[PDB]
Symmetry: C4
Subunit: 388 residues, 4 copies
């Protein structure tokens, strides 16, 4: 086994075709399925696996009630081949309430986070053994990606926040070579917040499309130079914008460098990925609520401010339904590195308060240089059927 | 790993001996089993696996109700070793409501179909990565085999329809070398319809025994020349005939070249496989309803029109019971390539409307050059026991 | 991989120490466990697996009722590593209502039997493919071992009956080299019946301790000469005797050559295995009912008629409980070939008619050249707890 | 595969970071989970597995009632990768009511104990085959570690008691090279009792931190010389002390050589592990009841009597909750051998007599040379939710 160095062109995609759905909630009505959220999928040179954080229980468990809350001791990081539901036979690869995973080529690094909010811990596991540990630095919740990290040559990047969701924060980018952090590099850029970065291998570095829970609703970019550790974090030129809540589609703006301050409040985990001066991206159809999922390409959107030349749309999930988080997902072709992407479809309380638990399914789409039809793939489960 | 080139004689079989049953419905009363239909089994140089399309749920799920319908977003392609039931621990290898799978020798290609009926998409997955995509072409349901495709030397064939079930249609035969379609070839032949082809490796090409939902009740043949892409599609000389509904057994006819127009309406997925001028084939015992399964050899039936010299019958499934689809299943011997075949036994609504869900079990029989006894293997599950 | 030729001394054992129990019935009250009976365990050069025939269902299935009957279409041959219960995730390796399995070294041969009683079929599977088939020969139930077959050099033996349980019968010994029967050899010996042979590798041939459902209650021996195909079947010299029902322990007799005619009626699957002029054997404590299990060594018992010098007893299962079938189980040491043995503990109807289903657990003991304590390991499950 | 010889420095740890929790009880409310207790985890050069002894059943089984009792025929030794719950798909690797497991490098040795209390047996399994057996020697319960044994060069140590819990006893240290005991060595030392030793590879020998159910509440040390078989068993210099029940924290004492006689009665399985003249150890927060878990380092505590210079505490499990047993768990780093440790959290009768069954979850922590936060990880399951 030599290393995963990614030297190879990205694919000139033409849109996305469907790859995987698991029906996690549906089956949850007839089987014992874990309680999840904040999923993501990543793969080694052979199989694509699917992760997510549980709630130390199952859905048809009287326990599950109040799964709305993101952190609790009993939450663990699951793993399965891409395609199997999360069952009583799944493994809790580590304790955590946040994470990131990359396959450096040789084996896995699994950053998993847990502790008190104000003082928590981050175990850096690798190849099964626990290679390192680094604790919270601001004293107000150490959180990470909830997406696949990226490694190149033998060094795995991973961005980390601990600060004030809607406020300033310390963003560091740890460079851990084999479960062992070997160098940390402090954030720099126009980016007024970095959180839930969706990172990918666009050689020689790593580029990140994050979230901004404070003033921006136009994703902040985070570019890592795996070559010298230096950082750079701009903002997206695309005038379209994909974050929720967000202004609209006409008064929606972005100048590639400053929080736009338009419902710049919260956010959601999102992705995007360049191609020349263009921009393949995705977001919720609803711009108030996290419902419906569409994906598209903005001409000029990566190199040019306030763009609006949308083209090649797709209604991945219908706007009458509901989605949630999503992240990019790379996966090296036999000549080019193709990007893929996932979408958790969250069914549960706060919204569908018919039941008291919260969990989620997933749908995933990859890159294609061929045709496709049209459609939308939701969780599609009868909340009047589901237990509780 | 060199390639699967099939250069090796087919076996001079003498009838079929039992191989596998899974009891899918029976266990479904005491366990959490997926909701299926349109199964098939295929194997790599080591294990035989069993496929089928689910209904994004399980049987003891209040959801399952109305599984009669063939397409919906939440239907996925399962896979398991030959012998295990479809459980909560099975994987959804792709989203689809149609498919085909072959092992080119090195790894798997998994055509899976999904989208709106009128406009749908076909993901061409291979080795886990998504190599290509080609969308619907007539705008009225892109459908494929629901049986194992066949590869030789490194090129995998797969026939595709999109048109009018009971009407004309476009039938194309895609030649995808490694998840990448590299050449499409348009249908040609006496065949007035091609749909649900049951294809196999009868070197140097590939030969297909399809269905005809319009005017024929005598299977149309579809011969592929993997050598130059050319096509040829005749009809079966056998005067016996195996399709349901169908005329009878005396006024049942076929001339090897034109729809016979005798209850030539619908059909069901069927198989057949030559041997000299003869014909080993199978069909439902009931010629109105898809009930009971028998298999036999018609002397003269492959090279001679309107044949009736039946011999070596078997009551695979009793005519008091019920079957459904079926397809051929090859599996290379240590000197000859033996054919095997499967039979879904569909238990569910429209018929057994005691319950509201529809799923199916399976029985499978291989080729033998030795003796056998007699019997019939049905789903045999108490519909008064089953849930719902 | 060279072949399993067994050239290596058997171990001078000193008694049996406990190896495996699975608690099949107990868990059956809190989980979905298959309905079984007629088990046995066998191993390849790495793992020991556990077999048995199911009843196409699970225990907490309303179907299971009337599992007392041995044959029905929906019965299949399971397989799992030695230690896991038979779950909804177990595989039906073949259809059958009888069987035998050996690992010739390279891979598995799985004789499985099914068909009408009067006319049935026997599929000879191997390495996943179906290599051969041979049908019933007397027209009254083709049955086999229900124990591990034995292979040496590359030829696998397997004894087969079809005749009259309590009457004469045809006993043949098929020699199948790679799923392909290559020579059948007709039974010869003092043995007035051969049925449920418990066979083992006592180089250069294979020796069998069977059952006799007609006139004997003293196990008939069946010695195979894998060298020239010739057969020889004596009877056990041991005057102790181990079969149920059986006379007693004082008027119990055997002369090494003729059915003794003492409650010589039915039987049960049993084992035994020589050592010099002695005899390590096992049987039920109850000599009317199949309850309790003990094992011991009779000095002189293999080379001398009507023996009674019992020594080294063990109460494997207490006589207040209940057992059933049992068979020998070899397993090559790092210098000597050690024998092991299993014991199904049948819980169910006809006896414990509190419930209407019948299934069974298992306990297994191997050979030891070291000390041991005392005890008894029953199914030990509350029939008042169990479902139905 | 060469052998596991451990020549390599232990790691200068700085405290413990979280690795694994499984939520065994929580899921037990929504799934079929085995009934356990007396767990432990151990690993081969690749995966870390988790063991424990069951109670031949599952929790939602009416059987489980009265799982308070430690021994019964139907108790078996489970095994799974580190992270999966104990499910109906787990294997019973042997019958036992006590055990120990080490990976000599090449494969596993699994001492499992069962029999009458007064006369029991100990099967010494290895690589799947049963290599040896040695029976009880005092006639009053042969018990072993309930923790991972340690092998070096090719010889696996394992300490064994059989005597009087609160009285004298015979303590032997068997040296079994490949499932075959090749030399037994009798205990020697100041140690007035050895029971439930928590052993580890501190090259060239093996050192053990046991329990004392008679007069001590200050762990007895047990040092093995794998070099010449000689033994040595002192007591811990640490004046802090970690055993429950125990005096307090001020009148708590130890002189490194004699039972201190302060609530020196019972105990619990514990661990500890040196580092220079210091001592990293752990115990229950409650000194009467086995509740809460903390871990720390006592300066001077390994080489100096009655120590009280505690530092680097952690509240692993909060004192408002409840723990149970615990043991050390080694795991070779890429330059140093890191120690890890587990903690069963027992939920069940005698205490939480709301229900009638007893089982347990687990939390596990490894060694780190990096920072960490703070927190506590309990079973945290609603006893008012749980079944029974
Ligand atoms: C490939 O396949 C697409 C699939 O797109 C999606 O369709 C759903 C909505 O139809 C969406 O939720 C789902 O998840 C799919 O992802 C092909 O067509 C698609 O469907 C139609 C047009 O073809 C577009 O959707 C619209 O949605 C409305 C809700 O269904 C529908 O009622 C709209 O209908 C109005 O125009 C149609 C035109 O055919 C016609 O039916 C009527 O005239 C109708 O008029 C309305 O007017 C009044 C006010 O609204 C009402 O009082 C009156 O009752 C009536 O509702 C409309 O059809 C969807 O966007 C479209 N997709 C795309 C990409 O165009 C598409 O043909 C093909 N394209 C490509 C590149 O392959
Ligand atoms: C190997 O094993 C076969 C197994 O074949 C199948 O048998 C079932 C039907 O019997 C079928 O559903 C099942 O699934 C099996 O696959 C051996 O025999 C088989 O069974 C019989 C003859 O041997 C054939 O089946 C017929 O089915 C009727 C329903 O059971 C049965 O009642 C018929 O019986 C009439 O003739 C028999 C001859 O033995 C005799 O019983 C009576 O005289 C009976 O007369 C009827 O007459 C009146 C009008 O019908 C009634 O008023 C009166 O009450 C009575 O019903 C018949 O036996 C089945 O086809 C046959 N299989 C084959 C291949 O022949 C077979 O012996 C052997 N062959 C080979 C090559 O190995
Ligand atoms: C290793 O370990 C053995 C284990 O053997 C088995 O014991 C159970 C029966 O006790 C059996 O079902 C279980 O499954 C075990 O496999 C050691 O001992 C074993 O137990 C005893 C003797 O040691 C033997 O079993 C007998 O079973 C009767 C039912 O329990 C029991 O009541 C008998 O007791 C009579 O004698 C004992 C002697 O100690 C004493 O208790 C009394 O005096 C009692 O007297 C009876 O007399 C009247 C009529 O019966 C009654 O009115 C009165 O109430 C009372 O019942 C007896 O103890 C069992 O066979 C034995 N096993 C072996 C191999 O000896 C054994 O010590 C040791 N051996 C070796 C080689 O390692
Ligand atoms: C990293 O993270 C630690 C986590 O430690 C643990 O905290 C829980 C207890 O708080 C424990 O069960 C849990 O499992 C954790 O493992 C950081 O702090 C930790 O929490 C606090 C202090 O920081 C310590 O715990 C104490 O526990 C009491 C129960 O919660 C709590 O009420 C105590 O509060 C008293 O002092 C605090 C100081 O901040 C303040 O809140 C009040 O003044 C309060 O006063 C009480 O006084 C009267 C009598 O008690 C009452 O009438 C009145 O109502 C009120 O209760 C206290 O805070 C815990 O030990 C501590 N851990 C450590 C290691 O210090 C820690 O800051 C950081 N350290 C490091 C190295 O990283
Ligand atoms: C990184 O990319 C590839 C794959 O890791 C490296 O491997 C060699 O690269 C090219 C073609 O890929 C040739 O020089 C060798 O034949 C490759 N070997 C294999 C097994 O692919 C490549 O050298 C690395 N290069 C950079 C610039 O990072
Ligand atoms: C990672 O991969 C290759 C590893 O070799 C790095 O490029 C190499 O450049 C040196 C001189 O710097 C050559 O001698 C190497 O052998 C080059 N690669 C090849 C295939 O020749 C590359 O620049 C590194 N990139 C990153 C992002 O870390
Ligand atoms: C295709 O069939 C076989 C198997 O793929 C090819 O392999 C060689 O073929 C024959 C015997 O099978 C000999 O020439 C070689 O010894 C074979 N090698 C092996 C490993 O079997 C064969 O050459 C191919 N031929 C055609 C005509 O397609
Ligand atoms: C059968 O037994 C063994 C094992 O199959 C054969 O293997 C050779 O036998 C001996 C020692 O076992 C030596 O001649 C070789 O070194 C063995 N090789 C191995 C890999 O064990 C043996 O020759 C066979 N002999 C008979 C008489 O059947
Ligand atoms: C099975 O195994 C060995 C295979 O070699 C057989 O014994 C051999 O005897 C021949 C001459 O007959 C020698 O040249 C072989 O090489 C011998 N074995 C060895 C290791 O030398 C053996 O007799 C056969 N036994 C059975 C029961 O089939
Ligand atoms: C035990 O430790 C190591 C690992 O088992 C042995 O292996 C050799 O040891 C050193 C470095 O580890 C060198 O002499 C060799 O290069 C090692 N080989 C490998 C594959 O690591 C070591 O010799 C053994 N030594 C002792 C003292 O027990
Ligand atoms: C276990 O491991 C090594 C095995 O070699 C033992 O040390 C060896 O010492 C001899 C002379 O005694 C050398 O020739 C060996 O080759 C040494 N090891 C190495 C790598 O050179 C060691 O002392 C043994 N220790 C224990 C606890 O059993
Ligand atoms: Ca925002
Ligand atoms: Ca038709
Ligand atoms: Ca008899
Ligand atoms: Ca004590």
């Amino acid at each position: 086994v030599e290393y995963r160095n990614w030297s190879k062109p990205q694919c000139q995609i033409t849109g996305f075709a469907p790859f995987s759905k698991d029906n996690s909630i549906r089956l949850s009505a007839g089987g014992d399925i874990w309680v999840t959220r904040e999923p993501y999928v990543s793969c080694d040179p052979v199989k694509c696996y699917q992760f997510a954080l549980g709630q130390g229980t199952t859905l048809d468990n009287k326990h599950s009630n109040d799964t709305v809350h993101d952190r609790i001791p009993h939450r663990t990081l699951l793993m399965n081949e891409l395609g199997v539901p999360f069952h009583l036979g799944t493994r809790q690869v580590c304790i955590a309430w946040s994470s990131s995973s990359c396959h450096d080529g040789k084996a896995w690094l699994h950053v998993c986070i847990t502790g008190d909010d104000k003082n928590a811990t981050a175990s850096f596991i690798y190849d099964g053994r626990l290679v390192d540990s680094i604790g919270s630095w601001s004293q107000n919740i150490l959180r990470t990606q909830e997406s696949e990290c990226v490694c190149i040559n033998g060094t795995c990047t991973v961005v980390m926040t601990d600060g004030s969701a809607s406020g300033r924060a310390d963003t560091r980018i740890l460079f851990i070579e084999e479960g062992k952090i070997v160098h940390i590099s402090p954030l720099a850029g126009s980016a007024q917040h970095v959180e839930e970065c969706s990172c990918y291998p666009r050689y020689p570095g790593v580029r990140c499309i994050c979230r901004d829970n404070w003033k921006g609703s136009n994703r902040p970019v985070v570019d890592i130079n795996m070559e010298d550790y230096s950082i750079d974090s701009s903002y997206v030129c695309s005038g379209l914008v994909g974050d929720t809540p967000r202004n609209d589609d006409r008064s929606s703006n972005s100048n590639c460098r400053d929080p736009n301050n338009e419902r710049g409040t919260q956010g959601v985990k999102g992705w995007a990925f360049d191609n020349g001066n263009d921009l393949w991206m995705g977001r919720t159809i609803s711009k108030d609520l996290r419902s419906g999922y569409e994906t598209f390409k903005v001409i000029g959107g990566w190199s040019t401010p306030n763009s609006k030349s949308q083209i090649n749309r797709q209604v991945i999930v219908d706007s009458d339904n509901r989605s949630g988080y999503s992240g990019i997902f790379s996966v090296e072709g036999k000549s080019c590195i193709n990007r893929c992407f996932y979408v958790e479809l969250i069914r549960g309380r706060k919204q569908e308060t018919r039941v008291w638990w919260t969990s989620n399914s997933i749908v995933v789409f990859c890159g294609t240089s061929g045709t496709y039809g049209t459609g939308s793939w939701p969780d599609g489960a009868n909340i009047n059927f589901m237990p509780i």
